[PDB]
């Protein structure tokens with residue numbers, strides 16, 4: 001019954017309320033496509049597993065008294081006040097912030113969790129201090145056994161824990177974010193301080209970060225195992241181990257992998273589903289992205305069910321954690337049509353033609369080839 | 378100075394001698410493409426790391442007295458005579474047998490190791506007893522901590538060890554091979570008994586198998602670490618972690634993955650490089666394969682540098698560990714042309730447009746898009 005603006009001060013009233021407690025808001029697709037360069041805080045999706053009491057606003061939060069512990073496998077563990085970061089060199093990164101569960105509702109049969117369509121994604125700029133720059137300023141060196149960064153959320157207001165482990169390789173780009181889109185980081189988006197890992201799924205970008213621990217192993221909390229994992233052959237070159245749709249899987253550390261690197265994807269922004277569009281030359285537009293480790297090589301479109309794929313034009317060629325706009329202009333005769341889009345990156349990653357092959361019981365990492373049916377007048 | 382037939386009795390004299398000691402023979406490409414359904418023993422490539430004395434023939438070897446130990450994390454370790462397998466249910470599998478290093482010479486700058494072009498591959502049928510069927514017949518159950526199959530070669534004739542670990546998930550298809558292409562398994566191809574893992578690189582298919590050990594960890598031999606590995610983020614969804622070409626990498630268990638699942642690939646068999654072919658309709662032929670876990674979705678060809686990709690026709694649609702033949706008939710005007718081929722499978726795997734992005738100092742897992750330049754008359 002409450003609208004998004006009543007749950008979170010300053011949110012657009014049209015955001016879809018997937019959950020009140022905890023707070024989960026989805027961007028309507030028509031609103032998402034209206035901001036193809038950068039998703040503003042008024043429409044950016046929300047997914048809390050754990051609400052921090054009083055942080056349910058798009059307004060900034062005070063850094064005053066916000067202490068962060070840095071420990072585990074470092075030579076000299078230390079605590080810093082967030083305000084110290086104001087004096088350190090700052091960097092910004094434009095990145096796709098996407099929920100592990102975005103696309104969940106496209107799996108069949110229905111999976112468990114927030115029933116996202118494609119509105120659990122945004123493209124935003126975070127600004128703050130690189131974690132490696134803070135360690136350098138403090139004169140701290142990582143231990144040889146440090147294989148993970150394990151980030152813990154604040155538990156202020158008697159909140160449950162929220163603990164995520166990412167690979168130590170994420171230290172290269174890890175960012176203590178103080179700002180989003182040039183403004184104070186919204187409280188509801190993890191203000192006053194969020195640890196962001198560019199090119200990693202949203203779950204890993206810990207809002208209200210209070211502890212940063214260098215660990216030899218993945219943390220053993222529920223939020224790390226069995227949740228936020230997909231079936232896999234560990235350290236083998238297959239994106240996931242396909243399973244029978246609808247079957248429960250016995251998740252362990254040794255037969256499943258975490259939601260970490262953002263799955264390669266492309267979204268069609270124009271035309272929209274069921275739209276009538278004019279003339280014979282139809283300009284198909286969208287966005288594409290990967291985990292930012294390598295550049296995209298192509299985004300390709302098919303209007304003949306994959307018999308032929310046509311290279312689209314990309315807005316930029318260089319790799320990015322942020323999405324890249326694309327367009328392909330197709331000659332189409334009047335009547336019903338269907339266009340599909342697929343991304344292809346420099347290490348050969350692409351999208352499955354049938355996204356349901358990735359069926360998993362909590363419905364993570366959907367990246368099936370997007371199809372749009374429309375009419376040419 | 379010795380020809381292939383002088384190093385290994387019954388090999389075609391035209392095989393390329395890459396190494397005498399140990400024995401490494403490469404199939405010339407024109408000979409490989411001449412057998413597009415099944416590679417015969419007369420032309421099949423050889424790569425020994427460790428020669429077993431007297432096993433340098435295409436002739437079969439006696440099973441008499443060949444004892445295999447099965448141990449580690451099983452309830453009831455046991456030893457069996459290879460001849461026992463004659464009485465057990467047998468299965469056969471057609472599979473791509475490809476060296477980890479196939480394509481090595483296409484990396485730039487030059488890497489270390491056997492300078493394969495594309496002739497370190499064959500498509501063969503192995504027949505014997507599934508390892509899981511032997512465990513079932515013997516009434517043996519795997520321990521909960523069994524995470525690897527660790528296969529040891531015979532050390533008869535004072536030979537050095539050869540020890541490979543694969544994931545326990547490989548138990549599903551693991552095969553104790555007694556025959557190849559309907560004949561006694563050639564001694565030089567691991568007769569009288571070879572443990573084969575369909576869809577895994579050649580290195581893992583241990584010739585002259587003497588011990589099969591279920592282990593909690595990868596073995597710590599030189600042949601497991603640092604050799605036969607590529608840089609990676611362990612348990613993250615990227616086929617490898619790209620590195621600067623020509624730079625030495627500090628391989629460990631925690632920053633690199635083994636050569637395990639066969640990398641998705643496609644080879645163009647017709648036309649051949651620099652060939653003149655007739656008329657306007659050019660029939661491009663080749664083979665494609667992956668690790669057999671999922672079907673291919675398409676093989677696609679481009680004659681315009683990737684601006685458009687055209688779906689080829691596949692010989693078969695069902696998944697296979699063996700290669701699948703494909704053909705695309707292209708309308709081409711007279712003059713110089715270049716055709717590229719790319720495979721795409723059901724989980725979205727494809728090939729990098731520039732294979733050199735995978736540069737690694739021992740030159741493993743090359744799978745760059747193959748290009749063939751030819752003339753249309």
Ligand code: MSS
Nearest residue numbers: 045046047048049050099100153202203207
């Ligand atoms: N602290 C914290 N953080 C955090 C959380 C919680 O709950 N808490 N969630 C997750 C998730 S889950 Mo799924 O994978 S997506 C997601 C994200 C979201 O973001 P935004 O809300 O800002 O949009 O966040 C992330 N982070």
Ligand code: MSS
Nearest residue numbers: 422423424425426427476477530579580584
């Ligand atoms: N026992 C044994 N096994 C074995 C060896 C040795 O040395 N030893 N080598 C490897 C390798 S390395 Mo590279 O990844 S390839 C390969 C293969 C081959 O096979 P053939 O010769 O039958 O073709 O084998 C495999 N196995």
